[PDB]
Tab-separated table of N, CA and C in Angstrom:
chain	number	residue	atom	x	y	z
A	1	UNK	N	106.538	80.227	117.694
A	1	UNK	CA	105.351	79.493	117.066
A	1	UNK	C	104.261	80.554	116.763
A	2	UNK	N	103.721	81.070	117.889
A	2	UNK	CA	102.638	82.158	117.786
A	2	UNK	C	103.100	83.269	116.933
A	3	UNK	N	104.358	83.886	117.050
A	3	UNK	CA	104.693	85.031	116.253
A	3	UNK	C	104.893	84.607	114.711
A	4	UNK	N	105.470	83.350	114.558
A	4	UNK	CA	105.634	83.013	113.083
A	4	UNK	C	104.498	82.786	112.381
A	5	UNK	N	103.404	82.205	112.999
A	5	UNK	CA	102.154	81.991	112.341
A	5	UNK	C	101.588	83.269	111.929
A	6	UNK	N	101.575	84.351	112.742
A	6	UNK	CA	101.038	85.634	112.473
A	6	UNK	C	101.855	86.247	111.267
A	7	UNK	N	103.206	86.302	111.458
A	7	UNK	CA	104.029	86.901	110.397
A	7	UNK	C	103.837	86.294	109.035
A	8	UNK	N	103.693	84.885	108.964
A	8	UNK	CA	103.523	84.252	107.764
A	8	UNK	C	102.101	84.524	107.284
A	9	UNK	N	101.117	84.551	108.095
A	9	UNK	CA	99.765	84.652	107.722
A	9	UNK	C	99.548	86.129	107.048
A	10	UNK	N	100.231	87.102	107.538
A	10	UNK	CA	100.026	88.415	106.945
A	10	UNK	C	101.163	88.920	106.101
A	11	UNK	N	102.124	88.041	105.708
A	11	UNK	CA	103.008	88.470	104.683
A	11	UNK	C	104.154	89.319	105.187
A	12	UNK	N	104.328	89.435	106.535
A	12	UNK	CA	105.467	90.193	107.044
A	12	UNK	C	106.742	89.478	106.839
A	13	UNK	N	107.528	89.880	105.804
A	13	UNK	CA	108.504	88.960	105.360
A	13	UNK	C	109.817	89.043	106.076
A	14	UNK	N	110.190	90.308	106.562
A	14	UNK	CA	111.279	90.584	107.379
A	14	UNK	C	111.244	89.780	108.729
A	15	UNK	N	110.058	89.843	109.351
A	15	UNK	CA	109.932	89.070	110.540
A	15	UNK	C	110.200	87.578	110.314
A	16	UNK	N	109.759	87.054	109.222
A	16	UNK	CA	110.027	85.701	108.852
A	16	UNK	C	111.471	85.413	108.656
A	17	UNK	N	112.144	86.304	107.987
A	17	UNK	CA	113.564	86.124	107.765
A	17	UNK	C	114.384	86.175	109.170
A	18	UNK	N	113.924	86.976	110.098
A	18	UNK	CA	114.518	87.068	111.337
A	18	UNK	C	114.358	85.839	112.161
A	19	UNK	N	113.067	85.321	112.217
A	19	UNK	CA	112.781	84.203	113.046
A	19	UNK	C	113.420	82.935	112.472
A	20	UNK	N	113.482	82.775	111.245
A	20	UNK	CA	114.087	81.582	110.602
A	20	UNK	C	115.546	81.796	110.381
A	21	UNK	N	116.254	82.004	111.535
A	21	UNK	CA	117.725	82.087	111.566
A	21	UNK	C	118.270	80.905	112.401
A	22	UNK	N	119.510	80.664	112.122
A	22	UNK	CA	120.091	79.454	112.707
A	22	UNK	C	119.406	78.118	112.354
A	23	UNK	N	119.398	77.961	111.114
A	23	UNK	CA	118.695	76.916	110.464
A	23	UNK	C	119.291	75.588	110.899
A	24	UNK	N	118.584	74.844	111.776
A	24	UNK	CA	119.096	73.541	112.352
A	24	UNK	C	117.908	72.756	112.891
A	25	UNK	N	116.871	73.511	113.536
A	25	UNK	CA	115.767	72.868	114.129
A	25	UNK	C	114.572	73.144	113.192
A	26	UNK	N	114.205	72.140	112.369
A	26	UNK	CA	112.989	72.248	111.444
A	26	UNK	C	111.742	71.920	112.160
A	27	UNK	N	111.698	71.800	113.498
A	27	UNK	CA	110.447	71.519	114.183
A	27	UNK	C	109.583	72.764	114.189
A	28	UNK	N	110.107	73.854	114.277
A	28	UNK	CA	109.325	75.084	114.298
A	28	UNK	C	108.780	75.311	112.919
A	29	UNK	N	109.422	74.994	111.815
A	29	UNK	CA	108.996	75.326	110.517
A	29	UNK	C	107.849	74.474	110.097
A	30	UNK	N	107.822	73.223	110.470
A	30	UNK	CA	106.817	72.277	109.980
A	30	UNK	C	105.828	71.884	111.156
A	31	UNK	N	105.459	72.831	111.917
A	31	UNK	CA	104.471	72.583	112.956
A	31	UNK	C	103.186	73.416	112.812
A	32	UNK	N	102.004	72.760	112.926
A	32	UNK	CA	100.761	73.433	112.621
A	32	UNK	C	100.190	73.876	113.853
A	33	UNK	N	99.124	74.761	113.791
A	33	UNK	CA	98.457	75.241	114.936
A	33	UNK	C	97.361	74.243	115.386
A	34	UNK	N	96.278	74.762	115.879
A	34	UNK	CA	95.219	73.845	116.343
A	34	UNK	C	94.490	73.201	115.262
A	35	UNK	N	94.290	73.885	114.112
A	35	UNK	CA	93.725	73.289	112.977
A	35	UNK	C	94.689	72.505	112.026
A	36	UNK	N	95.879	72.363	112.502
A	36	UNK	CA	96.910	71.632	111.831
A	36	UNK	C	97.403	72.416	110.559
A	37	UNK	N	97.338	73.711	110.549
A	37	UNK	CA	97.876	74.467	109.411
A	37	UNK	C	99.275	75.082	109.619
A	38	UNK	N	100.255	74.601	108.925
A	38	UNK	CA	101.597	75.025	108.984
A	38	UNK	C	101.706	76.368	108.483
A	39	UNK	N	102.860	77.102	108.739
A	39	UNK	CA	102.940	78.452	108.135
A	39	UNK	C	102.699	78.432	106.598
A	40	UNK	N	103.281	77.488	105.943
A	40	UNK	CA	103.036	77.375	104.443
A	40	UNK	C	101.545	77.420	104.158
A	41	UNK	N	100.718	76.760	104.912
A	41	UNK	CA	99.262	76.761	104.630
A	41	UNK	C	98.728	78.098	104.749
A	42	UNK	N	99.201	78.872	105.833
A	42	UNK	CA	98.568	80.268	105.983
A	42	UNK	C	99.101	81.173	104.897
A	43	UNK	N	100.400	81.222	104.661
A	43	UNK	CA	101.018	82.081	103.683
A	43	UNK	C	100.330	81.797	102.259
A	44	UNK	N	100.006	80.621	101.928
A	44	UNK	CA	99.384	80.327	100.713
A	44	UNK	C	97.860	80.686	100.704
A	45	UNK	N	97.323	80.523	101.986
A	45	UNK	CA	95.826	80.868	101.976
A	45	UNK	C	95.612	82.380	101.831
A	46	UNK	N	96.459	83.220	102.237
A	46	UNK	CA	96.306	84.631	102.057
A	46	UNK	C	97.021	85.165	100.859
A	47	UNK	N	97.757	84.274	100.105
A	47	UNK	CA	98.265	84.583	98.791
A	47	UNK	C	99.565	85.412	98.886
A	48	UNK	N	100.504	85.093	99.699
A	48	UNK	CA	101.735	85.856	99.803
A	48	UNK	C	102.800	84.951	99.196
A	49	UNK	N	103.178	85.226	97.908
A	49	UNK	CA	104.001	84.333	97.177
A	49	UNK	C	105.478	84.455	97.522
A	50	UNK	N	105.932	85.605	98.038
A	50	UNK	CA	107.297	85.763	98.601
A	50	UNK	C	107.532	84.896	99.746
A	51	UNK	N	106.633	84.939	100.703
A	51	UNK	CA	106.661	84.169	101.990
A	51	UNK	C	106.774	82.694	101.619
A	52	UNK	N	105.887	82.327	100.698
A	52	UNK	CA	105.854	80.858	100.277
A	52	UNK	C	107.203	80.457	99.647
A	53	UNK	N	107.750	81.310	98.850
A	53	UNK	CA	109.069	80.998	98.198
A	53	UNK	C	110.181	80.856	99.278
A	54	UNK	N	110.164	81.834	100.223
A	54	UNK	CA	111.117	81.747	101.292
A	54	UNK	C	110.981	80.537	102.058
A	55	UNK	N	109.810	80.100	102.438
A	55	UNK	CA	109.570	78.979	103.296
A	55	UNK	C	110.001	77.621	102.447
A	56	UNK	N	109.763	77.647	101.162
A	56	UNK	CA	110.102	76.477	100.435
A	56	UNK	C	111.588	76.336	100.256
A	57	UNK	N	112.301	77.547	100.153
A	57	UNK	CA	113.826	77.471	100.112
A	57	UNK	C	114.344	76.875	101.400
A	58	UNK	N	113.510	76.721	102.469
A	58	UNK	CA	114.013	76.039	103.642
A	58	UNK	C	113.352	74.653	103.710
A	59	UNK	N	112.400	74.375	102.807
A	59	UNK	CA	111.776	73.100	102.659
A	59	UNK	C	110.717	72.942	103.827
A	60	UNK	N	109.429	72.757	103.290
A	60	UNK	CA	108.260	72.714	104.278
A	60	UNK	C	107.468	71.505	104.049
A	61	UNK	N	107.736	70.627	103.162
A	61	UNK	CA	107.291	69.183	103.118
A	61	UNK	C	105.908	69.002	102.638
A	62	UNK	N	105.085	70.031	102.550
A	62	UNK	CA	103.694	69.920	102.060
A	62	UNK	C	102.879	68.876	102.878
A	63	UNK	N	102.586	69.221	104.136
A	63	UNK	CA	101.815	68.386	105.008
A	63	UNK	C	100.363	68.588	104.502
A	64	UNK	N	99.484	68.297	105.671
A	64	UNK	CA	98.023	68.390	105.460
A	64	UNK	C	97.364	68.681	106.856
A	65	UNK	N	96.365	69.500	106.723
A	65	UNK	CA	95.620	69.997	107.893
A	65	UNK	C	94.587	68.884	108.288
A	66	UNK	N	93.668	69.384	109.240
A	66	UNK	CA	92.603	68.446	109.714
A	66	UNK	C	91.464	68.310	108.651
A	67	UNK	N	91.638	68.650	107.551
A	67	UNK	CA	90.706	68.329	106.478
A	67	UNK	C	91.408	67.880	105.182
A	68	UNK	N	92.691	67.448	105.220
A	68	UNK	CA	93.385	66.900	104.122
A	68	UNK	C	93.903	67.928	103.097
A	69	UNK	N	93.567	69.215	103.257
A	69	UNK	CA	94.045	70.207	102.280
A	69	UNK	C	95.555	70.308	102.311
A	70	UNK	N	95.967	70.798	101.295
A	70	UNK	CA	97.456	71.225	101.109
A	70	UNK	C	97.537	72.696	100.800
A	71	UNK	N	98.795	73.120	100.583
A	71	UNK	CA	98.997	74.628	100.306
A	71	UNK	C	98.310	74.925	99.005
A	72	UNK	N	98.356	73.976	97.969
A	72	UNK	CA	97.738	74.167	96.747
A	72	UNK	C	96.284	74.218	96.788
A	73	UNK	N	95.682	73.356	97.743
A	73	UNK	CA	94.190	73.536	97.955
A	73	UNK	C	93.878	74.982	98.380
A	74	UNK	N	94.536	75.513	99.305
A	74	UNK	CA	94.236	76.874	99.817
A	74	UNK	C	94.485	77.915	98.677
A	75	UNK	N	95.655	77.863	98.100
A	75	UNK	CA	95.967	78.851	97.023
A	75	UNK	C	94.962	78.802	95.930
A	76	UNK	N	94.382	77.679	95.634
A	76	UNK	CA	93.434	77.606	94.552
A	76	UNK	C	92.075	78.014	95.043
A	77	UNK	N	91.640	77.699	96.263
A	77	UNK	CA	90.413	78.195	96.741
A	77	UNK	C	90.376	79.679	96.703
A	78	UNK	N	91.603	80.346	96.983
A	78	UNK	CA	91.607	81.757	97.059
A	78	UNK	C	91.659	82.329	95.554
A	79	UNK	N	92.413	81.577	94.711
A	79	UNK	CA	92.608	82.147	93.293
A	79	UNK	C	93.778	82.824	92.961
A	80	UNK	N	94.767	82.741	93.874
A	80	UNK	CA	96.110	83.503	93.732
A	80	UNK	C	96.904	82.675	92.828
A	81	UNK	N	96.957	83.065	91.457
A	81	UNK	CA	97.707	82.304	90.497
A	81	UNK	C	99.191	82.355	90.773
A	82	UNK	N	99.545	83.504	91.368
A	82	UNK	CA	101.102	83.608	91.511
A	82	UNK	C	101.718	82.595	92.492
A	83	UNK	N	101.034	82.539	93.665
A	83	UNK	CA	101.604	81.553	94.597
A	83	UNK	C	101.329	80.078	94.079
A	84	UNK	N	100.298	79.862	93.354
A	84	UNK	CA	100.093	78.609	92.661
A	84	UNK	C	101.338	78.298	91.796
A	85	UNK	N	101.671	79.253	90.962
A	85	UNK	CA	102.829	79.093	90.016
A	85	UNK	C	104.103	78.863	90.731
A	86	UNK	N	104.267	79.468	92.000
A	86	UNK	CA	105.443	79.284	92.834
A	86	UNK	C	105.408	77.848	93.375
A	87	UNK	N	104.293	77.438	93.823
A	87	UNK	CA	104.254	75.990	94.316
A	87	UNK	C	104.546	74.935	93.197
A	88	UNK	N	103.992	75.212	91.982
A	88	UNK	CA	103.984	74.199	90.978
A	88	UNK	C	105.368	74.066	90.354
A	89	UNK	N	106.458	74.631	90.973
A	89	UNK	CA	107.730	74.409	90.403
A	89	UNK	C	108.767	73.849	91.413
A	90	UNK	N	108.328	72.969	92.213
A	90	UNK	CA	109.116	72.464	93.284
A	90	UNK	C	109.259	70.905	93.308
A	91	UNK	N	108.206	70.320	93.920
A	91	UNK	CA	108.126	68.870	93.906
A	91	UNK	C	107.351	68.295	92.817
A	92	UNK	N	106.346	69.046	92.315
A	92	UNK	CA	105.484	68.630	91.142
A	92	UNK	C	104.811	67.355	91.362
A	93	UNK	N	104.552	66.969	92.718
A	93	UNK	CA	103.844	65.790	93.055
A	93	UNK	C	102.578	65.999	93.851
A	94	UNK	N	102.264	67.290	94.170
A	94	UNK	CA	101.157	67.640	94.970
A	94	UNK	C	99.933	67.964	94.149
A	95	UNK	N	100.045	67.964	92.736
A	95	UNK	CA	99.007	68.453	91.912
A	95	UNK	C	97.790	67.617	92.033
A	96	UNK	N	97.921	66.300	92.352
A	96	UNK	CA	96.860	65.313	92.405
A	96	UNK	C	96.610	64.673	93.723
A	97	UNK	N	96.662	65.573	94.808
A	97	UNK	CA	96.321	65.178	96.149
A	97	UNK	C	94.821	65.333	96.396
A	98	UNK	N	94.400	64.598	97.372
A	98	UNK	CA	92.960	64.589	97.634
A	98	UNK	C	92.645	64.790	99.173
A	99	UNK	N	91.648	65.527	99.449
A	99	UNK	CA	91.306	65.861	100.775
A	99	UNK	C	90.431	64.723	101.382
A	100	UNK	N	89.584	65.133	102.289
A	100	UNK	CA	88.695	64.099	102.942
A	100	UNK	C	87.510	63.687	102.038
A	101	UNK	N	87.169	64.399	101.075
A	101	UNK	CA	86.101	64.178	100.182
A	101	UNK	C	86.603	63.893	98.799
A	102	UNK	N	87.870	63.573	98.572
A	102	UNK	CA	88.404	63.269	97.239
A	102	UNK	C	88.305	64.415	96.259
A	103	UNK	N	88.408	65.700	96.757
A	103	UNK	CA	88.485	66.843	95.867
A	103	UNK	C	89.941	67.173	95.622
A	104	UNK	N	90.242	67.451	94.307
A	104	UNK	CA	91.629	68.039	94.046
A	104	UNK	C	91.547	69.566	94.058
A	105	UNK	N	92.756	70.179	93.794
A	105	UNK	CA	92.762	71.590	93.761
A	105	UNK	C	91.961	72.121	92.566
A	106	UNK	N	91.934	71.388	91.540
A	106	UNK	CA	90.991	71.834	90.437
A	106	UNK	C	89.594	71.899	90.776
A	107	UNK	N	89.022	70.991	91.627
A	107	UNK	CA	87.680	71.021	92.072
A	107	UNK	C	87.513	72.472	92.747
A	108	UNK	N	88.314	72.863	93.606
A	108	UNK	CA	88.040	74.091	94.316
A	108	UNK	C	88.197	75.353	93.455
A	109	UNK	N	89.226	75.328	92.512
A	109	UNK	CA	89.374	76.451	91.658
A	109	UNK	C	88.212	76.598	90.787
A	110	UNK	N	87.596	75.481	90.389
A	110	UNK	CA	86.506	75.560	89.514
A	110	UNK	C	85.210	75.865	90.271
A	111	UNK	N	84.995	75.334	91.523
A	111	UNK	CA	83.832	75.714	92.289
A	111	UNK	C	83.810	77.137	92.661
A	112	UNK	N	84.870	77.771	92.937
A	112	UNK	CA	84.967	79.157	93.267
A	112	UNK	C	84.891	80.124	92.087
A	113	UNK	N	85.045	79.715	90.955
A	113	UNK	CA	84.954	80.544	89.745
A	113	UNK	C	86.187	81.263	89.343
A	114	UNK	N	87.364	80.723	89.664
A	114	UNK	CA	88.677	81.265	89.254
A	114	UNK	C	89.155	80.811	87.899
A	115	UNK	N	88.903	81.559	86.778
A	115	UNK	CA	89.157	81.054	85.473
A	115	UNK	C	90.610	80.839	85.278
A	116	UNK	N	91.446	81.908	85.711
A	116	UNK	CA	92.841	81.831	85.383
A	116	UNK	C	93.537	80.662	86.208
A	117	UNK	N	93.015	80.411	87.392
A	117	UNK	CA	93.526	79.322	88.181
A	117	UNK	C	93.309	77.969	87.489
B	1	UNK	N	72.932	100.526	85.803
B	1	UNK	CA	73.318	100.224	87.183
B	1	UNK	C	74.184	99.027	87.306
B	2	UNK	N	74.152	98.079	86.347
B	2	UNK	CA	75.094	96.928	86.198
B	2	UNK	C	76.539	97.553	86.024
B	3	UNK	N	76.566	98.546	85.095
B	3	UNK	CA	77.886	99.100	84.857
B	3	UNK	C	78.448	99.713	86.139
B	4	UNK	N	77.571	100.443	86.793
B	4	UNK	CA	78.049	101.068	88.009
B	4	UNK	C	78.395	100.079	89.056
B	5	UNK	N	77.756	98.988	89.226
B	5	UNK	CA	78.070	97.916	90.110
B	5	UNK	C	79.479	97.299	89.790
B	6	UNK	N	79.790	97.147	88.571
B	6	UNK	CA	81.114	96.612	88.142
B	6	UNK	C	82.206	97.558	88.548
B	7	UNK	N	81.993	98.831	88.286
B	7	UNK	CA	82.990	99.808	88.775
B	7	UNK	C	83.220	99.790	90.229
B	8	UNK	N	82.114	99.687	90.965
B	8	UNK	CA	82.222	99.590	92.473
B	8	UNK	C	83.092	98.338	92.882
B	9	UNK	N	82.891	97.160	92.187
B	9	UNK	CA	83.618	95.968	92.554
B	9	UNK	C	85.120	96.244	92.289
B	10	UNK	N	85.432	96.814	91.159
B	10	UNK	CA	86.903	97.108	90.817
B	10	UNK	C	87.503	97.962	91.896
B	11	UNK	N	86.900	99.000	92.263
B	11	UNK	CA	87.381	99.911	93.349
B	11	UNK	C	87.608	99.155	94.540
B	12	UNK	N	86.565	98.361	95.033
B	12	UNK	CA	86.762	97.678	96.269
B	12	UNK	C	87.841	96.685	96.369
B	13	UNK	N	88.186	96.076	95.183
B	13	UNK	CA	89.310	95.133	95.154
B	13	UNK	C	90.611	95.882	95.251
B	14	UNK	N	90.809	97.032	94.619
B	14	UNK	CA	91.928	97.821	94.824
B	14	UNK	C	92.188	98.124	96.253
B	15	UNK	N	91.117	98.591	96.862
B	15	UNK	CA	91.203	99.011	98.271
B	15	UNK	C	91.574	97.823	99.140
B	16	UNK	N	91.044	96.620	98.924
B	16	UNK	CA	91.389	95.464	99.709
B	16	UNK	C	92.904	95.216	99.588
B	17	UNK	N	93.449	95.315	98.397
B	17	UNK	CA	94.911	95.157	98.144
B	17	UNK	C	95.704	96.151	99.086
B	18	UNK	N	95.249	97.415	99.085
B	18	UNK	CA	96.015	98.466	99.833
B	18	UNK	C	95.923	98.059	101.414
B	19	UNK	N	94.794	97.542	101.825
B	19	UNK	CA	94.704	97.220	103.307
B	19	UNK	C	95.668	96.135	103.622
B	20	UNK	N	95.719	95.085	102.834
B	20	UNK	CA	96.642	93.993	103.033
B	20	UNK	C	98.155	94.528	103.052
B	21	UNK	N	98.485	95.483	102.215
B	21	UNK	CA	99.700	96.077	102.256
B	21	UNK	C	99.993	96.754	103.530
B	22	UNK	N	99.026	97.487	104.084
B	22	UNK	CA	99.182	98.207	105.332
B	22	UNK	C	99.519	97.111	106.427
B	23	UNK	N	98.775	96.048	106.515
B	23	UNK	CA	98.937	95.034	107.581
B	23	UNK	C	100.366	94.493	107.414
B	24	UNK	N	100.795	94.221	106.169
B	24	UNK	CA	102.156	93.597	106.048
B	24	UNK	C	103.278	94.577	106.196
B	25	UNK	N	103.084	95.903	106.374
B	25	UNK	CA	104.182	96.844	106.481
B	25	UNK	C	104.341	97.500	107.839
B	26	UNK	N	103.178	97.398	108.629
B	26	UNK	CA	103.056	98.335	109.858
B	26	UNK	C	103.995	97.802	110.926
B	27	UNK	N	104.097	98.636	112.037
B	27	UNK	CA	104.905	98.355	113.181
B	27	UNK	C	104.091	97.766	114.181
B	28	UNK	N	104.589	96.732	114.817
B	28	UNK	CA	103.996	96.071	115.964
B	28	UNK	C	104.967	95.723	117.002
B	29	UNK	N	104.818	96.253	118.192
B	29	UNK	CA	105.768	96.197	119.261
B	29	UNK	C	105.096	95.882	120.616
B	30	UNK	N	104.120	96.672	120.979
B	30	UNK	CA	103.560	96.457	122.428
B	30	UNK	C	102.481	95.276	122.273
B	31	UNK	N	101.900	95.114	121.096
B	31	UNK	CA	100.834	94.139	120.903
B	31	UNK	C	101.339	92.864	120.316
B	32	UNK	N	102.670	92.544	120.476
B	32	UNK	CA	103.147	91.231	119.877
B	32	UNK	C	102.826	90.126	120.894
B	33	UNK	N	102.882	88.922	120.331
B	33	UNK	CA	102.499	87.670	121.044
B	33	UNK	C	103.749	87.063	121.515
C	1	UNK	N	66.935	102.868	94.195
C	1	UNK	CA	68.111	102.146	94.439
C	1	UNK	C	69.283	102.586	93.656
C	2	UNK	N	68.949	103.329	92.420
C	2	UNK	CA	70.014	103.978	91.756
C	2	UNK	C	70.552	105.068	92.564
C	3	UNK	N	69.740	105.924	93.276
C	3	UNK	CA	70.268	106.951	94.052
C	3	UNK	C	71.092	106.448	95.294
C	4	UNK	N	70.581	105.355	95.815
C	4	UNK	CA	71.405	104.698	96.879
C	4	UNK	C	72.771	104.276	96.448
C	5	UNK	N	72.785	103.732	95.242
C	5	UNK	CA	74.046	103.156	94.699
C	5	UNK	C	75.028	104.349	94.492
C	6	UNK	N	74.550	105.506	94.088
C	6	UNK	CA	75.395	106.628	93.859
C	6	UNK	C	75.931	107.109	95.159
C	7	UNK	N	75.173	107.206	96.180
C	7	UNK	CA	75.727	107.657	97.474
C	7	UNK	C	76.662	106.616	97.954
C	8	UNK	N	76.515	105.382	97.725
C	8	UNK	CA	77.484	104.375	98.152
C	8	UNK	C	78.755	104.652	97.404
C	9	UNK	N	78.773	104.805	96.115
C	9	UNK	CA	80.043	105.082	95.434
C	9	UNK	C	80.825	106.339	96.001
C	10	UNK	N	79.988	107.417	96.253
C	10	UNK	CA	80.637	108.644	96.784
C	10	UNK	C	81.408	108.265	98.169
C	11	UNK	N	80.695	107.549	99.088
C	11	UNK	CA	81.335	107.256	100.338
C	11	UNK	C	82.588	106.383	100.105
C	12	UNK	N	82.537	105.457	99.161
C	12	UNK	CA	83.632	104.557	98.998
C	12	UNK	C	84.896	105.301	98.489
C	13	UNK	N	84.613	106.349	97.648
C	13	UNK	CA	85.702	107.078	97.108
C	13	UNK	C	86.422	107.920	98.226
C	14	UNK	N	85.589	108.508	99.022
C	14	UNK	CA	86.110	109.163	100.200
C	14	UNK	C	86.995	108.323	101.059
C	15	UNK	N	86.610	107.115	101.355
C	15	UNK	CA	87.275	106.028	102.109
C	15	UNK	C	88.595	105.767	101.558
C	16	UNK	N	88.555	105.549	100.214
C	16	UNK	CA	89.780	105.224	99.439
C	16	UNK	C	90.905	106.360	99.650
C	17	UNK	N	90.430	107.544	99.578
C	17	UNK	CA	91.374	108.708	99.778
C	17	UNK	C	92.073	108.665	101.214
C	18	UNK	N	91.111	108.318	102.183
C	18	UNK	CA	91.625	108.280	103.506
C	18	UNK	C	92.716	107.142	103.703
C	19	UNK	N	92.487	106.012	103.114
C	19	UNK	CA	93.406	104.857	103.122
C	19	UNK	C	94.694	105.269	102.564
C	20	UNK	N	94.664	105.974	101.385
C	20	UNK	CA	95.975	106.374	100.732
C	20	UNK	C	96.711	107.329	101.711
C	21	UNK	N	96.006	108.186	102.306
C	21	UNK	CA	96.705	109.112	103.283
C	21	UNK	C	97.295	108.276	104.421
C	22	UNK	N	96.698	107.156	105.003
C	22	UNK	CA	97.236	106.422	106.029
C	22	UNK	C	98.596	105.902	105.485
C	23	UNK	N	98.605	105.303	104.330
C	23	UNK	CA	99.811	104.605	103.710
C	23	UNK	C	100.951	105.688	103.646
C	24	UNK	N	100.589	106.899	103.265
C	24	UNK	CA	101.684	107.803	103.022
C	24	UNK	C	102.120	108.510	104.271
C	25	UNK	N	101.414	108.361	105.418
C	25	UNK	CA	101.913	108.921	106.683
C	25	UNK	C	102.442	108.063	107.650
C	26	UNK	N	102.243	106.720	107.529
C	26	UNK	CA	102.539	105.802	108.559
C	26	UNK	C	104.057	105.696	108.931
C	27	UNK	N	104.300	104.935	109.969
C	27	UNK	CA	105.765	104.689	110.299
C	27	UNK	C	106.100	103.256	109.843
C	28	UNK	N	107.262	103.217	109.229
C	28	UNK	CA	107.826	101.927	108.667
C	28	UNK	C	109.309	101.811	109.061
C	29	UNK	N	109.601	100.832	109.923
C	29	UNK	CA	110.989	100.735	110.455
C	29	UNK	C	111.481	99.342	110.392
C	30	UNK	N	110.704	98.366	110.960
C	30	UNK	CA	111.299	96.938	110.923
C	30	UNK	C	110.978	96.297	109.575
C	31	UNK	N	109.959	96.672	108.893
C	31	UNK	CA	109.609	96.007	107.571
C	31	UNK	C	110.121	96.926	106.420
C	32	UNK	N	111.192	97.622	106.632
C	32	UNK	CA	111.736	98.317	105.462
C	32	UNK	C	112.596	97.475	104.597
C	33	UNK	N	112.773	97.768	103.291
C	33	UNK	CA	113.503	96.985	102.366
C	33	UNK	C	114.987	97.418	102.306
């Protein structure tokens, strides 16, 4: 739990591939820390598209933390267009999610000034 | 000085990318959790 | 403040060189491709 969060948060991909072996218990994959942020949230927050792709290939459900944000909210707040493009080719249903204040991902991408996002 | 500041920003962003690469490639053994 | 900005640029360039040296000397074992 603690190692996987670090490895995903800093893009250490081989550590993630090693930890995510013997795929049978998805309780470790979709479990958030104290702020309720799953590994997918962290990997997208720091903008590591390869880790996001690897986690999605195992299925990560797109949950929500203690502020209603999703992976796309973080990726847009940061401005990483590549991980956004990776996310937008899977379920295609998270584009219009809302946090605690009814903000979409577009709200954040525009507030922070990321034109390409 | 505006031009100088823009060049400074560009260089700092390249440096930030390099540092993130360092963190994602380094060895961690004794200080693991 | 122009003089100050020039000194800042000089220091940042030295730092960038040091970081590139770190990357080219470090150990990479578990995170190799």
